[PDB]
């Protein structure tokens, strides 16, 4: 703060400035597929399919 | 799909794109025209016709 006071007043008050935490968490959960395929079905596509 | 898991969790579960098919039929229909014209009609217009 800044405050206007005579020439013969006494003071203001202690008024400092402050800065804070700020945060974000990275070790929560990830982002998965999971296709899991045979091994007969993909050995017939290669011949059924075009 | 693809969802969220946490990182000491487990496999989510199976997935995979599909095809599908259209099969647009051409064996039924057909654009016909016909003439029926003599064979005197064919022979006097064409020694009088301009």
Redesign the interface.
Known sequence: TATGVAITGSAPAASMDATLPAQLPI???????????NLKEIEESKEQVT
């Open positions: 070790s929560a959960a990830s982002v998965q597929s999971t296709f899991t395929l």
